[PDB]
Amino acid sequence: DEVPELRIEKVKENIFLHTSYSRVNGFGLVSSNGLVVIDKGNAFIVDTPWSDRDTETLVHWIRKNGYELLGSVSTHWHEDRTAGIKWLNDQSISTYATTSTNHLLKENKKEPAKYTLKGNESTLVDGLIEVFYPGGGHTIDNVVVWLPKSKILFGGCFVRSLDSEGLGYTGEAHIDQWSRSAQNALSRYSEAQIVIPGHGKIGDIALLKHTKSLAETAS
Ligand SMILES: [Zn+2]
Ligand SMILES: [Zn+2]
């Protein structure tokens, strides 16, 4: 039960991908994706690392590199997205999640984000980061994050990588809605050039298409 260390790798100008891991009953060591988005000296975090140590590591690197850290958002409630919220709260770094995500954190006796994003859409950092509820999928609360300056959509675990043979854990999934929700995102972000899933390799808008088809067959 050793697990690698976090890493952080430039995706393109001002966008870094953070990868970290956890060991999971009946599945093993599992990688997990998140971002650091930069705009003119400012950093915002999309999803936390899957542990405090990795969260700490990630923050230190943001500070070391001189960025002002405006906060983090989580894209659904499960630990792989939110584990670091508590540590972040205690170090007075602002945490965000939607209403529906915060409800499920509390309702599952987890530390809630400090601030709450209301409605289906919200913006963060002067329009640099948009948050959108495409509808039910992986979970009832899942949101995507769109980065218009970069033409990047961070799908979170709402989007499956191309080599996924299925939808992953569907205990809390809305399988029959997922296909429509995926289509909602496809219509809305036809401009998207890079799409980043919650687990696995990044690609283009093809990931949203594959995810859509997976939802169709899972029905
Ligand atoms: Zn999940
Ligand atoms: Zn996930």
Coordinates of C-alpha atoms and ligand atoms in Angstrom, one line a residue:
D1 CA 0.0 0.0 0.0
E2 CA 2.8 2.5 -1.0
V3 CA 1.4 4.9 -3.6
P4 CA 3.2 7.2 -6.0
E5 CA 3.5 10.8 -5.6
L6 CA 1.5 13.5 -7.2
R7 CA 2.8 15.0 -10.4
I8 CA 1.9 18.1 -12.3
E9 CA 2.4 18.4 -16.0
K10 CA 1.6 21.3 -18.4
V11 CA -1.3 20.6 -20.8
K12 CA -0.9 23.8 -22.7
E13 CA -0.2 27.5 -21.9
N14 CA -1.4 28.2 -18.3
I15 CA -3.0 24.8 -17.7
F16 CA -1.5 22.1 -15.7
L17 CA -2.8 18.6 -15.1
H18 CA -2.3 17.0 -11.7
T19 CA -2.4 13.3 -11.4
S20 CA -2.6 11.4 -8.1
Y21 CA -3.7 8.0 -6.9
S22 CA -5.5 5.9 -4.3
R23 CA -5.9 2.2 -3.5
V24 CA -9.6 1.1 -3.7
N25 CA -11.2 -2.2 -2.5
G26 CA -11.8 -4.7 -5.5
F27 CA -10.1 -2.3 -8.1
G28 CA -6.5 -1.6 -6.8
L29 CA -4.3 1.5 -7.4
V30 CA -6.4 4.1 -9.4
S31 CA -5.2 7.3 -10.9
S32 CA -7.2 10.5 -10.8
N33 CA -7.0 13.8 -12.8
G34 CA -7.4 17.5 -11.7
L35 CA -6.1 20.9 -13.1
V36 CA -4.4 24.1 -12.1
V37 CA -5.6 26.9 -14.2
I38 CA -3.6 30.2 -14.3
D39 CA -4.7 33.7 -15.4
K40 CA -2.2 36.6 -15.0
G41 CA -0.4 35.5 -11.7
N42 CA -3.6 33.8 -10.4
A43 CA -4.1 30.1 -9.8
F44 CA -7.4 28.1 -9.4
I45 CA -7.6 24.4 -8.7
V46 CA -10.1 22.1 -10.5
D47 CA -10.6 19.1 -8.1
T48 CA -8.4 18.1 -5.2
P49 CA -5.8 15.4 -5.1
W50 CA -7.0 12.2 -3.5
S51 CA -5.0 12.8 -0.3
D52 CA -3.7 15.6 2.1
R53 CA -0.1 14.9 1.4
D54 CA -0.8 15.3 -2.4
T55 CA -3.0 18.3 -1.7
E56 CA -0.1 19.8 0.4
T57 CA 2.4 19.0 -2.3
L58 CA 0.1 20.7 -4.9
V59 CA -0.4 23.9 -2.9
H60 CA 3.4 24.2 -2.2
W61 CA 4.1 24.1 -5.9
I62 CA 1.5 26.7 -6.6
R63 CA 3.0 29.0 -3.9
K64 CA 6.6 28.2 -4.7
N65 CA 5.9 29.3 -8.3
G66 CA 4.5 32.6 -7.1
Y67 CA 0.9 32.3 -8.2
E68 CA -1.8 33.8 -6.0
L69 CA -4.2 31.0 -5.2
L70 CA -7.8 32.1 -5.5
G71 CA -9.3 28.6 -4.5
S72 CA -10.5 25.2 -5.7
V73 CA -13.8 23.8 -6.9
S74 CA -14.9 20.1 -6.8
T75 CA -16.9 18.6 -9.7
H76 CA -18.8 16.0 -7.7
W77 CA -18.7 14.8 -4.1
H78 CA -16.8 11.6 -4.1
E79 CA -13.4 11.4 -2.3
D80 CA -11.3 11.6 -5.5
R81 CA -12.6 15.1 -6.2
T82 CA -13.1 16.4 -2.6
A83 CA -10.6 14.7 -0.3
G84 CA -8.5 17.8 0.1
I85 CA -11.3 20.2 0.9
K86 CA -10.7 19.9 4.7
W87 CA -7.0 20.6 4.5
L88 CA -7.8 23.5 2.2
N89 CA -10.3 24.9 4.7
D90 CA -7.8 24.8 7.6
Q91 CA -5.2 26.6 5.5
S92 CA -7.8 29.3 4.7
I93 CA -7.8 28.6 1.0
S94 CA -11.3 29.1 -0.5
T95 CA -13.3 26.0 -1.5
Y96 CA -16.3 25.8 -3.8
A97 CA -18.9 23.2 -4.8
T98 CA -22.4 23.3 -6.0
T99 CA -25.4 23.2 -3.7
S100 CA -26.1 19.6 -4.7
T101 CA -22.5 18.6 -4.2
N102 CA -22.4 20.4 -0.7
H103 CA -25.7 18.7 0.3
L104 CA -24.2 15.2 -0.5
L105 CA -20.9 16.0 1.3
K106 CA -22.9 16.9 4.5
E107 CA -25.5 14.2 4.0
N108 CA -22.4 11.8 3.8
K109 CA -20.7 13.4 6.9
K110 CA -17.9 14.9 4.9
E111 CA -16.4 18.3 5.2
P112 CA -18.4 20.7 2.9
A113 CA -16.8 23.3 0.6
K114 CA -16.8 26.8 2.2
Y115 CA -18.8 28.5 -0.6
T116 CA -21.7 27.2 -2.7
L117 CA -22.4 27.6 -6.5
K118 CA -26.1 28.1 -7.1
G119 CA -28.1 27.3 -10.1
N120 CA -27.0 25.3 -13.2
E121 CA -24.2 27.7 -14.2
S122 CA -21.7 29.8 -12.4
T123 CA -18.5 31.6 -13.2
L124 CA -15.3 31.9 -11.2
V125 CA -12.3 34.2 -11.6
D126 CA -13.8 37.0 -13.9
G127 CA -15.2 34.5 -16.4
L128 CA -12.0 32.5 -16.8
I129 CA -13.7 29.4 -15.3
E130 CA -17.3 28.4 -16.1
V131 CA -19.1 25.6 -14.2
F132 CA -22.1 23.8 -15.9
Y133 CA -24.6 21.2 -14.8
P134 CA -25.1 19.1 -18.0
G135 CA -27.7 16.9 -16.2
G136 CA -27.4 13.6 -14.3
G137 CA -24.7 11.1 -15.2
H138 CA -22.1 9.5 -13.1
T139 CA -23.9 11.2 -10.2
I140 CA -26.8 13.4 -9.7
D141 CA -24.5 16.4 -8.9
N142 CA -21.8 16.1 -11.5
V143 CA -20.6 19.3 -13.2
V144 CA -18.2 20.1 -15.9
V145 CA -15.8 23.0 -16.1
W146 CA -15.2 25.0 -19.3
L147 CA -12.2 27.1 -19.9
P148 CA -13.1 29.4 -22.8
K149 CA -9.6 31.0 -23.3
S150 CA -8.2 27.5 -23.7
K151 CA -11.1 25.7 -25.4
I152 CA -10.7 23.1 -22.7
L153 CA -13.6 21.2 -21.1
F154 CA -12.8 19.5 -17.8
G155 CA -15.4 16.7 -17.8
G156 CA -14.5 15.2 -14.5
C157 CA -15.9 11.7 -14.0
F158 CA -18.9 12.6 -16.1
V159 CA -16.6 11.8 -19.1
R160 CA -14.9 8.5 -19.7
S161 CA -11.6 8.1 -21.4
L162 CA -11.5 6.5 -24.8
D163 CA -10.1 3.1 -23.5
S164 CA -12.8 2.8 -20.8
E165 CA -15.0 -0.3 -21.7
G166 CA -17.8 0.9 -19.4
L167 CA -19.0 3.7 -17.3
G168 CA -17.1 2.7 -14.0
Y169 CA -19.0 2.7 -10.7
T170 CA -22.7 3.2 -11.4
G171 CA -24.2 2.6 -8.0
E172 CA -25.3 6.2 -7.9
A173 CA -25.5 6.8 -11.7
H174 CA -28.4 8.1 -13.8
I175 CA -27.7 5.8 -16.8
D176 CA -30.8 6.7 -18.9
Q177 CA -30.2 10.5 -18.4
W178 CA -26.4 10.3 -19.0
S179 CA -26.8 9.9 -22.7
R180 CA -28.9 13.1 -22.9
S181 CA -26.6 14.9 -20.5
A182 CA -23.6 14.0 -22.6
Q183 CA -25.5 15.4 -25.6
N184 CA -26.2 18.6 -23.7
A185 CA -22.5 19.1 -23.1
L186 CA -21.7 18.2 -26.8
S187 CA -24.2 20.9 -28.1
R188 CA -22.9 23.4 -25.6
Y189 CA -19.2 22.9 -26.1
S190 CA -18.8 22.0 -29.8
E191 CA -15.9 24.6 -29.7
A192 CA -14.0 22.3 -27.3
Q193 CA -10.5 21.3 -28.5
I194 CA -9.3 19.4 -25.5
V195 CA -11.5 17.3 -23.2
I196 CA -10.1 16.0 -19.9
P197 CA -11.7 13.0 -18.2
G198 CA -11.6 12.3 -14.4
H199 CA -9.5 9.1 -14.9
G200 CA -7.3 8.4 -17.8
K201 CA -5.8 10.0 -20.9
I202 CA -7.0 13.3 -22.3
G203 CA -8.3 13.7 -25.8
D204 CA -10.7 15.8 -27.8
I205 CA -14.5 16.0 -28.1
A206 CA -14.4 12.3 -29.1
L207 CA -14.5 11.4 -25.3
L208 CA -17.9 13.0 -25.0
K209 CA -19.1 10.9 -28.0
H210 CA -17.7 7.7 -26.6
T211 CA -19.2 8.5 -23.1
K212 CA -22.5 9.2 -24.8
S213 CA -22.4 5.8 -26.6
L214 CA -21.5 3.9 -23.4
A215 CA -24.5 5.4 -21.7
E216 CA -26.7 4.3 -24.6
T217 CA -25.6 0.6 -24.3
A218 CA -25.6 0.6 -20.6
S219 CA -29.5 1.3 -20.8
Ligands
ZN1 ZN -17.4 9.5 -8.4
ZN2 ZN -13.9 9.7 -10.4

